[PDB]
Design a protein around this ligand. Structure first.
Ligand SMILES: Cc1cc2nc3c(=O)[nH]c(=O)nc-3n(C[C@H](O)[C@H](O)[C@H](O)COP(=O)(O)OP(=O)(O)OC[C@H]3O[C@@H](n4cnc5c(N)ncnc54)[C@H](O)[C@@H]3O)c2cc1C
Ligand SMILES: Cc1cc2nc3c(=O)[nH]c(=O)nc-3n(C[C@H](O)[C@H](O)[C@H](O)COP(=O)(O)O)c2cc1C
Length: 613
């Protein structure tokens, strides 16, 4: 049962697509590949590599006309994902030989980091070295531009390749097989019906420790406020009560929240679809010998599925539109939906400029294409899961640990579709009234994630903190940690803040807080780079360059640690370049030597990054 080659033997399937997903994209890609395998006379399913050992690749060739496909991503400095760590270290430690096995590898990654599909290349090269056989070239899938484009091109070029390598036919077209079947329930008590729980049944009522991604803890929003004095952007501050929850964290860590989707969106989707949203149901996988029982845990109603378990806000993938094409009554709209999932042609640019660029969700695509009324169960089938959203902690463990803090920006923009598009978690927390009073709490589920973004072990070490926008939250955690250390008697070295904002009267975050921090000596020097008040634009890297004379001496003698967090599009790169210039000009040192010195700094942990984009 544990081994999956036996499951191949019983199910009669031959092609496997592995996924190393954490945010769901690789899982969906593997599921799509396994579904598409039926179109070419073959049968297979996508299986998660965590519950299955990889020693079964030796027994894999025992299946005639077999194949295995890998769709893996990576995080950090080329580190494996949580599910793929066992695969990675087994690959590291393995010494067996795999002769006659056939494989393919698709890589998921981002161009902005140096380890660009590190895991895909590593798996391909390790399989080749170990003695396996390549069939199709590696997929250089980059998330910097469009990721669906690369995968669709790789699939369109790969299926004919394996088809000609194996000699099978491809007569069948537009099969569009289903993966789950509807099971309605008429009389079923709410005791065994999910009402928003992620893991155990009825978890949201009587929680037990520990609490993590699978079993979040609902915190109570004690208070919140609008930090910025302007009105163009709603920069908000949250305080979540963590009393008696046993959650132990540290400053600079990450708090993750499971949002609830907009009720208006679900109501409008149900109204336009014309279905009873309060129908208790279930979706059962046809392949019984699969660990994915349902796309979301069931039984549950339609309303719960579209509120707490589905993602109806981000643009749909090409496979969803292709699977929904046949439900379009009007031939032209059906043809548009069919060609939307192509590899080139005018339909490709139409998809690019109509779904992703215009940011059209499922409701928008339904409204703009009125001759399209797909069944609600099919829409719940196709749509991806709802992903948790993570925020940096603005509190400290050595200071009040009973509550965590969140600095967030309310997402609101005028999408090119002409529709007001609203963020899920930011606006969900924005609508969370502090309440309190008699019994209202406005509960919010959450769990904490550990990270390496930490203060130095000894308080004597100077700390340099640079980040604009909402990046001040871990910096504030560090600041009040240092303030607590100073007020506790122990001396604390130099602490520097390098912050940026547009205007002092528009989005200056925590004027009073950092004012008192500087006036009390906790923050030795505050440095704020206004971005719109003066005629030109002065950013944080300008302040770094201007303080270079102190910064170089601090790094050389005090062993100061560098912390950077915020947006990664331009800020991190220019901060890196400024640090290169400062460490090279004051060496004197060459560019390559300065880069090597900075990498050596990172290897010791004195340089840290907590960027996000
Ligand atoms: C490690 C990590 C740490 C983070 N820390 C923080 C933190 O400390 N504070 C914080 O506020 N957030 C933080 N985030 C971001 C947070 O997790 C969410 O991504 C963010 O709050 C987006 O809002 P949402 O949750 O509603 O997402 P969504 O509703 O998915 O909205 C975001 C989506 O909308 C798009 N979008 C947004 N604005 C526009 C626009 N003007 N034009 C076009 N597209 C647009 C984005 O590209 C993205 O696709 C962090 C993320 C990570 C991964
Ligand atoms: C926190 C974070 C770290 C990442 N690190 C890497 C990386 O080290 N190398 C890389 O190629 N891509 C990296 N990426 C990009 C992801 O690989 C890319 O978004 C991919 O589509 C994610 O696949 P998934 O949805 O299956 O998790 C990172 C993305 C995030 C959010």
């Amino acid at each position: 049962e544990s081994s999956f080659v036996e499951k191949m033997k019983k199910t009669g399937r031959n092609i496997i697509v592995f996924y190393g997903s954490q945010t769901g994209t690789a899982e969906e890609f593997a599921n799509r590949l396994s579904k598409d395998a039926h179109r070419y006379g073959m049968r297979g399913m996508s299986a998660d590599p965590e519950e299955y050992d990889l020693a079964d690749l030796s027994s894999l060739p025992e299946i005639d006309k077999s194949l295995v496909v890998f769709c893996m991503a990576t995080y950090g400095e080329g580190d494996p994902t949580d599910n793929a760590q066992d695969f990675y270290d087994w690959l590291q430690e393995t010494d067996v030989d795999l002769t006659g096995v056939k494989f393919a590898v698709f890589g998921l990654g981002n161009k902005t980091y140096e380890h660009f599909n590190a895991m895909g290349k590593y798996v391909d090269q390790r399989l080749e070295q170990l003695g396996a056989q390549r069939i199709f070239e590696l997929g250089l899938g980059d998330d910097d531009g469009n990721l669906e484009e690369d995968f669709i091109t790789w699939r369109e070029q790969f299926w004919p390749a394996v088809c000609e390598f194996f000699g099978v036919e491809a007569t069948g077209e537009e099969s569009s097989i289903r993966q789950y079947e509807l099971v309605v329930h008429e009389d079923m008590d709410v005791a065994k019906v999910y009402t928003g729980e992620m893991g155990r049944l009825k978890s949201y009522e009587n929680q037990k420790p520990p609490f993590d991604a699978k079993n979040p803890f609902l915190a109570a929003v004690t208070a919140n406020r609008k930090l910025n004095q302007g009105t163009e952007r709603h920069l908000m501050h949250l305080e979540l009560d963590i009393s008696d929850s046993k959650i132990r964290y540290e400053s600079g860590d990450h708090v993750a929240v499971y949002p609830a989707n907009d009720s208006a969106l679900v109501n409008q989707i149900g109204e336009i679809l014309g279905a009873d949203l309060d129908v208790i149901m279930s979706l059962n996988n046809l392949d019984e010998e699969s660990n994915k029982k349902h796309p979301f845990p069931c039984p549950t109603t339609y309303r719960t599925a579209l509120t707490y378990y589905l993602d109806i806000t981000n643009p749909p993938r090409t496979n969803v539109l292709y699977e929904l094409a046949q439900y379009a009554s009007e031939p032209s709209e059906q043809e548009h939906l069919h060609k939307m999932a192509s590899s080139s042609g005018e339909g490709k640019e139409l998809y690019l400029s109509w779904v992703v660029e215009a940011r059209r969700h499922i409701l928008a695509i339904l409204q703009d294409y009125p001759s399209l009324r797909p069944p609600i169960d099919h829409l719940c089938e196709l749509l991806p899961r709802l992903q948790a959203r993570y925020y940096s902690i603005a509190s400290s463990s050595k200071v009040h640990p009973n509550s965590v803090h969140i600095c967030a920006v309310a997402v609101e923009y005028e999408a090119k579709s002409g529709r007001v598009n609203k963020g899920v978690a930011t606006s969900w927390l924005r609508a969370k009234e502090p309440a309190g009073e008699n019994g209202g709490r406005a509960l919010v589920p959450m769990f904490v994630r550990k990270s390496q973004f930490r203060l130095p072990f000894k308080s004597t070490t100077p700390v340099i903190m640079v980040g604009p926008g909402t990046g001040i939250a871990p910096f504030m955690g560090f600041i009040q940690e240092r303030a607590w250390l100073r007020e506790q008697g122990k001396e604390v070295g130099e602490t520097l803040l390098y912050y940026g904002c547009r205007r002092s009267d528009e989005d200056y975050l925590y004027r009073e807080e950092l004012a008192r921090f500087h006036k009390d000596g906790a923050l030795t020097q505050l440095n704020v780079a206004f971005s719109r008040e003066q005629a030109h634009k002065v950013y944080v890297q300008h302040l770094l360059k201007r303080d270079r004379e102190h910064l170089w001496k601090l790094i050389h003698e005090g062993g100061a640690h560098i912390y950077v967090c915020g947006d990664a599009r331009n800020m991190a790169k220019d901060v890196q370049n400024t640090f290169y210039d400062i460490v090279a000009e004051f060496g004197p040192m060459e560019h390559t030597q300065a880069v090597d010195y900075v990498k050596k700094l990172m290897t010791k942990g004195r340089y840290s990054l907590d960027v996000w984009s």
